[PDB]
């Protein structure tokens, strides 16, 4: 029943938080409810973090979050127990100017792919709109932001051409000229003088501006800018004749992000920082799907920043960060590939995971993963101590591998990093699948990590 | 308000009746409800239909239905007002033997495409299972039928391969080896001696047998055969930022079938068969998507059978069927193509329809449609009288045309036949779209047809 | 022993009746012997069929036959029990003008393929000639018909080119210029045409040697020959084969295998049927031209079956018969051979959906309209088999494969009756010499016999 319940919570989480902004906001609220104190990056933390340590979190760009627990008795030699995952997922972004003239009466919006989207899997899917709106209340100068979400209303859909037309209906399709979202077909109010005051007037259809303004509860004239996504509004579902699966969009990598954060929360419940000598954290990054080379991506170093700022404010004595990282363990948690029975030729025998068993170690000898022999032994020892099962995933020698933030974090910190994650089918599809038990199994494993990684690594 | 309500009824209709069997059963129930008397094809109608005529309907194969209204004062010269549509839709059929050995633990079922399915649009879609089961209660010899439907449970899904793997993940995909539905991943009850009594034991996984037996409320041993489909369980939805669209699966051709049937029922409410001099009917065919050459398809002649049997039982005097058909008008109602703004190059200027305007006339000079100059004039006159709008659809000279049952019905009866229908986007996709007002506009047009076609045709 | 005997009877049947004309003539003769009364299509049957019903058969074009048994107590609601098969088989037809000048002394005849013949399987095969001759006895105007058959003499052979010549000897070969039957190599001393022979409307259209030969076979004068429809076919007699005699090798199995099995079943069944007591209407209708689409008057689309049932029911009783009710209560078995699993091409056969030799009838299933078989029909055949102690196999194509067709969909659409496509499976369909199980002819007869005996009782359960 526990696994079923957490599976449902995950489904609701995915459904109610479609964009990276919503996901980060969701975790921030969860953290607040569990007494983690928010610290602003733009302020020095010397007086915010005392010698008793505590539970805190910070956010960068509204899409990069780091939650951490610092014990009163922590010292550099104890290192840091880290779980890094990414909260961005393949999606479709409205262009800076999404406005398009009507085509034979059809209303459409100009968009661009974020990652490998706008392909055949994105055709004929109900797409909602949502994201971040920047506005300036009339009469003021302060710029504020609001999050909007059309769910359950699918405002647009990219229409496939009927096969009846022949060759023109065969893919692949041009992402600029053919995979364009259709948003409506209006029939014969004109822009008001006040609406025309918006810096966005003309850059987006007045109907769209009025719609998002209404969702945010502000005036069109107050809209300053926006960063909106188009996403599948179909709610996730437990599937399979025996209910062995969970079908849902954007699993990569909110599946691991969710599991890691919930594990951190469950773990934190029994941790009193006044009697703890550990430093634990779950850091969630944006932009992994586009290379991670952005200030809000893994290469932006929020993790390193949090550890340095915290250790500096924490004690009056200098902290040797090189010693800290040398004694740390970073779990780069990113979903990997579940065996797909219909494509046996691309999976390496003895090196593929199956549903509802446990976390999957990502192994690669050519640098695609940071996992090493010691890290592998550590995870397997951990699992043995906690009653967890560990699976493997490595590509066939004649295949190719995707990447993760693992190597970046390992190189940037110098800390042993282990790439692993909850395996899923159809990675990067608009609607993927994993085991109905995998969310709970993932939480269990990550919870065990925070509880016992230090004692286990001591044996090495 | 009426348009919004009928649009919602249509959505519910599609969702609650996934297979052709369900659709026919739905209409039969609706007809019983509106006082149409069911007549079995296996019995002579001489003592079921008399001088007073009345409202009746019959069914063939459980997938071919004909509803008709015969007035006491009808005569051969009055002809027959007909609307013919098809109730079969592209789907996926379980094979005679759907059993497949588990593959690395994964449960899969052997299926075959009905029409052009099992393509990329069918990948990563939540698929439910349903259809007709034939069973024989223990200790008896009688064979009975039962309809089952897993909705909302999606028992399977055809998993796309992650793009990370390269070329192997690029379509098109083999319909036999790559697009196979995954139904589960079982963990370690063995078949019982009684379950093995089923003629289907071994032909389908015992898990699937137990599941459909449970849905039908019968024992596994009692199952002797089945005709099941796999279909999208995502309920339809009104979409577009201005709610101008309706997104739903299996629109072709249940959209016209529903509109025509509802129009008949609305029309019948005010028809007094004791006074009426008309003979009206809506006949729904199976197998249009596979050529119509089956006994339950248009070429099977149920329409002609209904008219001959009815006219024979109706009066003691001989009825000249050639005169009947010479004075008849057949509307071959099959969905046609809405202009898709992203593929302007395949639509003929001045010969394409748009959403929420009205019925679309299907025109073709090379025999793909039966529509002629007189039929076109008749529909346009009919529309002018009822306050309906009429659109056009014809292919570009350098394009390709789909087909309909139109030419078959016209040739088989000798009656002037007009091909038309409610236009839709993405015909044959697993999830298509049409205007949110189009179901209502369609009903309005067809209602007008039954009411005024005789008076209009008289002018010619 | 019974299976072995019937297997031999089948082999003899195939060997002694090479063309569609011979096959129909063979069955007509068998029906006559078993007291089935012949009825001409050209005369009204009102006075030929009485209320006592009876056993009859009719023929159209000499290549389309329908045999039926009508019970005195039959009524529309009882429907009709039908087995439909085709008697035409892939062959080679002499052209309207088969004459060809000698080539370096070689005599050849101009021919055309009927279906997919004249390929590599037809090369280096001993070919006999036979078929229908139309003639008019000297001094008269009446046109008569005669059937001829050169068997065992193979008058023709299409010679493969020795591989020594290289590329030119590699197929495929042009059906008009390369696959031409060689009929002889004459020498001076074949006499010149006599004045009487030149009187034949066929003189000049076919070499005099051929005209004299077929005239001799028929027992008429060359001058009396007016027209002809002749085939070239393999004269190699069928044989029981396999180290354990598990197989039967023979030409033209598609679809004379099912046609023979169905007719024998009908005759065996008819032996115990007394029309004075019976309330059934049973028939085996054999069609021509299935191999070319069936759209001819003698093919399935020509409607001989529908005609027989309408004409019979009309002559049978004074009361009106509702044909729609008749067909709604009927079951049609479209019996056409399907594919036996070929172990050397496992990649084209669908797992769990292919038949093997010597087991039983094979149900032909297809979800895209190639077969008329449906869920109720499948259940009916399986129930029917369980009752008669017959085994039922399955055949359906892989999703990425291709399917052939049958007359099934045509018969179902034309009548409106539930139709089931099935048949005796064979290897190498459309080859000049195919193969099936040595027990399959017998198993087929057994199944079809069971169909006529119990289909009505079984269909009642639905
Ligand atoms: Zn990814
Ligand atoms: Zn990822
Ligand atoms: Zn269609
Ligand atoms: Zn259609
Ligand atoms: Zn054939
Ligand atoms: Zn055949």
């Amino acid at each position: 029943h526990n696994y079923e319940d957490i599976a449902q919570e995950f489904i609701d989480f995915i459904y109610k938080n479609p964009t990276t902004y919503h996901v980060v906001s969701f975790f921030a609220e969860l953290l607040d409810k569990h007494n983690f104190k928010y610290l602003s990056e733009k302020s020095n933390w010397q007086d915010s973090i005392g010698e008793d340590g505590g539970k805190f979190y910070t956010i960068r760009n509204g899409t990069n979050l780091s939650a951490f627990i610092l014990g009163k008795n922590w010292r550099a030699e104890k290192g840091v127990g880290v779980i890094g995952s990414h909260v961005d997922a393949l999606t479709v972004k409205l262009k800076p100017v999404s406005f398009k003239d009507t085509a034979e009466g059809y209303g459409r919006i100009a968009v661009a792919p974020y990652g490998g989207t706008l392909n055949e899997l994105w055709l004929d899917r109900d797409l909602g709109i949502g994201g971040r709106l920047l506005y300036k209340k009339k009469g003021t100068n302060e710029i504020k932001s609001a999050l909007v979400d059309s769910t359950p209303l699918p405002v647009c859909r990219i229409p496939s051409l009927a096969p009846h037309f022949g060759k023109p209906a065969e893919g692949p399709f041009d992402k600029e000229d053919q995979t364009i979202p259709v948003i409506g077909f209006p029939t014969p109010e004109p822009p008001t003088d006040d609406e025309k005051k918006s810096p966005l007037f003309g850059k987006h259809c007045i109907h769209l501006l009025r719609y998002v303004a209404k969702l945010a509860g502000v005036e069109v004239s107050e809209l300053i800018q926006m960063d909106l996504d188009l996403f599948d509004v179909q709610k996730g579902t437990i599937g399979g004749i025996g209910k062995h699966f969970l079908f849902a969009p954007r699993l990569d990598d909110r599946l691991c992000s969710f599991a890691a954060m919930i594990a951190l929360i469950c773990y934190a419940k029994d941790v009193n920082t006044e009697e703890s000598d550990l430093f634990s954290t779950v850091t969630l990054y944006d932009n992994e799907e586009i290379g991670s080379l952005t200030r809000q991506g893994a290469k932006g170093g929020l993790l390193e920043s949090v550890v340095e700022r915290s250790s500096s404010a924490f004690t009056k004595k200098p902290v040797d960060l090189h010693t800290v990282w040398a004694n740390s363990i970073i779990l780069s948690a990113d979903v990997n590939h579940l065996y797909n029975p219909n494509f046996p030729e691309v999976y390496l025998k003895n090196h593929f995971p199956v549903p509802n068993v446990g976390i999957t170690l990502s192994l690669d000898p050519n640098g695609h993963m940071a996992t090493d022999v010691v890290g592998t032994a550590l995870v397997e020892e951990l699992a043995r101590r906690n009653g967890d099962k560990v699976q493997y995933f490595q590509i066939k020698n004649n295949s190719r591998s995707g990447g993760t933030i693992g190597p970046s974090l390992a190189s940037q910190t110098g800390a042993r990093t282990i790439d692993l994650g909850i395996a899923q089918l159809s990675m990067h599809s608009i609607r993927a699948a994993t085991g109905s038990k995998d969310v709970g199994l993932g939480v269990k494993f990550f919870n065990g990590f925070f509880k016992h990684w230090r004692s286990v690594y001591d044996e090495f």
Side-chain angles (χ1 to χ4, degrees), chain A residues 3-137 139-141 143-166 168-188 190-206 208-213 215-268 270-315 318-460:
Chain A
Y3 288 77
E4 301 176 0
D5 293 336
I6 191 63
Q8 284 301 316
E9 289 302 320
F10 176 66
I11 289 175
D12 295 331
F13 155 70
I14 290 295
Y15 186 61
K16 298 176 180 177
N17 303 282
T19 76
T20 305
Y21 292 113
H22 292 92
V23 171
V24 169
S25 181
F26 170 87
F27 289 129
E29 277 184 41
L30 181 67
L31 288 163
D32 290 335
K33 176 179 175 178
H34 284 79
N35 296 96
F36 280 69
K37 177 183 166 191
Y38 170 80
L39 302 181
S40 172
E41 262 206 312
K42 292 184 176 56
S43 288
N44 170 275
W45 301 349
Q46 198 65 54
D47 302 315
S48 297
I49 299 179
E51 66 184 77
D52 280 352
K55 302 172 185 173
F56 316 80
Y57 75 97
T58 191
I59 304 172
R60 175 181 295 178
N61 200 64
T63 60
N64 184 195
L65 178 156
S66 181
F68 54 102
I69 306 172
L70 176 52
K72 178 181 183 302
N73 303 317
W74 177 77
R75 328 180 279 292
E77 301 226 11
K78 299 260 72 170
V80 184
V82 184
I83 293 182
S85 298
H86 69 92
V87 282
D88 63 312
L90 259 60
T91 188
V92 172
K93 296 285 189 178
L94 262 66
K95 278 170 174 142
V97 174
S98 74
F99 185 100
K100 291 186 70 70
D101 297 311
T102 50
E104 298 303 325
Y106 283 90
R108 294 180 297 176
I109 50 174
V111 300
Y114 175 77
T117 58
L118 294 181
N119 52 33
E120 275 158 288
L121 295 178
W122 275 72
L123 298 175
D124 304 342
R125 298 279 181 168
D126 293 14
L127 308 177
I129 185 168
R132 188 183 195 180
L133 254 46
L134 289 184
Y135 68 87
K136 177 191 298 177
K137 274 299 183 181
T140 72
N141 280 312
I143 300 303
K144 294 179 177 179
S145 77
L147 261 29
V148 295
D149 176 11
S150 74
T151 305
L153 178 64
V155 300
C156 66
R157 168 182 180 290
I158 308 172
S160 64
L161 178 63
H164 304 62
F165 293 98
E170 307 186 329
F173 300 103
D174 186 285
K175 298 193 297 296
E176 175 62 32
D177 301 321
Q178 305 183 303
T179 59
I180 308 173
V182 171
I183 193 160
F185 198 90
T187 53
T192 72
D193 285 357
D194 186 63
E195 301 178 314
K196 298 184 182 182
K197 293 179 179 178
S198 172
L200 292 182
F201 178 77
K203 302 190 181 186
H204 302 285
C205 180
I206 187 61
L208 176 61
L209 294 177
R210 285 172 181 159
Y211 181 72
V212 301
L215 290 181
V218 299
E219 302 305 309
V220 171
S221 67
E222 308 179 309
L223 295 179
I224 295 304
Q225 256 309 331
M226 46 188 230
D227 179 1
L228 305 179
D229 297 2
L230 285 193
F231 48 78
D232 196 334
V233 293
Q234 178 178 30
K235 178 167 181 150
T237 312
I238 294 299
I241 198 169
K243 300 187 181 183
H244 299 131
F245 306 105
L246 183 160
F247 307 147
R250 312 177 288 277
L251 293 186
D252 181 4
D253 182 35
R254 291 165 187 178
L255 184 47
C256 284
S257 292
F258 182 80
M261 282 303 308
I262 295 302
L264 179 68
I265 296 302
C266 289
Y267 164 79
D270 300 311
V271 173
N272 179 303
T273 55
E274 286 179 341
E275 292 286 346
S276 179
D277 60 356
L278 299 172
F279 191 165
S280 310
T281 175
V282 168
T283 297
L284 308 174
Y285 303 95
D286 187 7
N287 302 151
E288 183 286 331
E289 299 293 11
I290 58 171
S292 295
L293 191 71
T294 68
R295 74 178 194 120
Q296 55 271 341
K299 294 178 186 296
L302 179 58
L303 172 64
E304 299 92 294
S305 173
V306 166
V307 176
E308 168 161 35
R309 300 177 67 153
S310 295
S311 58
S312 289
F314 180 61
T315 178
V319 174
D320 175 15
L321 295 175
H322 293 291
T323 288
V324 174
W325 289 121
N327 288 288
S328 302
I329 287 295
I330 298 177
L331 295 194
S332 174
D334 198 352
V335 297
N336 34 39
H337 308 285
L338 269 178
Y339 179 77
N340 184 322
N342 299 336
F343 301 85
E345 69 282 357
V346 304
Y347 288 87
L348 178 62
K349 175 163 170 160
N350 296 319
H351 299 74
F352 60 71
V354 295
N356 311 311
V357 168
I359 205 72
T360 298
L361 250 191
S362 298
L363 305 131
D364 188 74
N366 292 103
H368 293 90
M369 300 297 154
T371 308
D372 59 12
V373 66
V374 171
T376 298
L378 183 156
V379 169
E380 302 187 317
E381 173 58 49
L382 245 188
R384 289 195 291 272
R385 294 191 184 185
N386 308 328
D388 293 309
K389 280 173 167 48
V390 180
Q391 311 194 77
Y392 290 169
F393 176 83
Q394 180 166 315
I395 63 167
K396 292 179 65 174
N397 300 347
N398 58 5
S399 184
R400 48 162 267 91
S401 173
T404 70
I405 64 181
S408 294
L409 296 182
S411 301
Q412 293 165 197
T413 62
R416 175 162 276 121
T417 302
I418 315 169
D419 273 286
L420 46 67
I422 299 173
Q424 68 167 88
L425 285 168
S426 315
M427 197 180 297
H428 287 193
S429 167
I430 194 176
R431 192 175 178 77
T434 188
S436 56
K437 253 78 194 134
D438 288 316
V439 175
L441 290 171
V443 172
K444 174 171 148 55
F445 174 74
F446 293 137
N447 189 5
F449 167 72
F450 286 128
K451 282 174 165 54
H452 312 297
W453 82 273
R454 188 59 273 175
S455 174
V456 175
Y457 200 32
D458 283 345
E459 301 298 356
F460 292 76

